[PDB]
Design a protein around this ligand. Sequence first.
Ligand SMILES: Oc1ccc(-c2nc3ccc(O)cn3c2I)cc1
Ligand SMILES: Oc1ccc(-c2nc3ccc(O)cn3c2I)cc1
Lengths: 9, 10, 232, 233
Amino acid sequence: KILHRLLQD
Amino acid sequence: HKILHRLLQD
Amino acid sequence: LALSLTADQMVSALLDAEPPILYSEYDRPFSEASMMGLLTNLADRELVHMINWAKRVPGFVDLTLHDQVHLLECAWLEILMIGLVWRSMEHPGKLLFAPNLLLDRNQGKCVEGMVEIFDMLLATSSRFRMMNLQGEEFVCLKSIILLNSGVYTFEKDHIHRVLDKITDTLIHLMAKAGLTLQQQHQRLAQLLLILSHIRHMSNKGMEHLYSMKCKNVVPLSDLLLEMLDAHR
Amino acid sequence: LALSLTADQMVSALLDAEPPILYSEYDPTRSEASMMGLLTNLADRELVHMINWAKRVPGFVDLTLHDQVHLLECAWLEILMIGLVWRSMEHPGKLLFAPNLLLDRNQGKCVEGMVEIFDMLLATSSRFRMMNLQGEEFVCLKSIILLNSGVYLEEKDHIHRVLDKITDTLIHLMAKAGLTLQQQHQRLAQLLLILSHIRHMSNKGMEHLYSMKCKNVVPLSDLLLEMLDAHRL
Ligand SMILES: Oc1ccc(-c2nc3ccc(O)cn3c2I)cc1
Ligand SMILES: Oc1ccc(-c2nc3ccc(O)cn3c2I)cc1
């Protein structure tokens, strides 16, 4: 999930 | 020519 | 003739306009075709009462015939659904389509693509319950849906004037119940934000209903087909 | 953290968190593939900024990571659309997707099924202009969408606490604008009823987008797919 990692940064 | 037309006017 | 009405007179007029609660066929575990059959049959009969309910909604008769048609075509599934949700408020975990038709959640899986819609409806019902939604508030919300949902899809000034009237009516109710000024607009907000989700559910229901048509699971009435054809 | 925030501090935080206005790769020359290409390209780049905006929306970071994903997966097109509608306010009869990409109803016909969505977007923009929507109100509505559209387990209680906080903020704004108590509630209602239509447009847009993905018209970024698959059409 790109959104997951993108919210993780 | 709508069925909804008829229901609304009677 | 709707703008010159007091808040209590608006509540009473709406309460008096409430459609009846209809029954389903009283009889065997459901298949996909049968469960869709009952639902569409129920909705088809409810639609007839909805039109006469709509005409009794203050300000709705003041609109042109075309406008009336447009608002109903746009909002009919929303209206059926908020009624369903309201009826199911005293039955947690279940959906009260009709007094002789109580469906939990597992029965939603009889029809493909339906269980997701059941969950949204049950969530709305659980939300109403949490807020302790009053009948007076409910009839305001349902009529708001009728007048609002199609108004940006077109006389428009009149509809917004009636919408404002219902807003004052809602506030009036909350002021009666003892809610402070802050609590009044907070609750007003909470209630109107549910309609965004009711809209969402209708759109999912519309596509799902259209899906049952394409797969020809159950034959649909001409009226239902016409309400259906008014959408994408 | 977000609960102990004043109305003016709430507006300030939201205003300061606003995403940039991105440009399109549009070069003026004479399709359905190109027009759809420009739009999906722009949304993909905007989505990155939306995430960082979302994290700056008071109360959002307090939620679990799973719930953050759910709220964005549900509301991303709603949020993009209200942004579009807001940018287009001063441009009647036209949609400002980007400062270099200003399209009218006629150009929407270049993509099939798109002119219907265009018309709805235009009416919303016209409705905003009619109400003279203020930026301070726009940022409140947009953050409401983020928090409201997916919330329907003490997570829900926190979201509703923030939503109530934003509601108080809106009322605070209207009181400063000189509106009476009656005018305050009425406008609040009018603004929140728009969100229903924005939900509708998003529902229709999502299906249209899914239709363009299966028809293999223009391709979609991996981010757009995951946002699209989240709605399961
Ligand atoms: O009172 C009613 C009657 C029918 C519905 C209803 N809900 C659905 C969902 C999917 C579908 O295909 C048809 N549906 C119907 I008819 C709701 C409330
Ligand atoms: O800021 C933006 C960017 C893109 C859109 C947008 N609107 C549509 C409509 C239909 C469709 O298939 C895709 N769309 C997109 I991507 C809106 C605002």
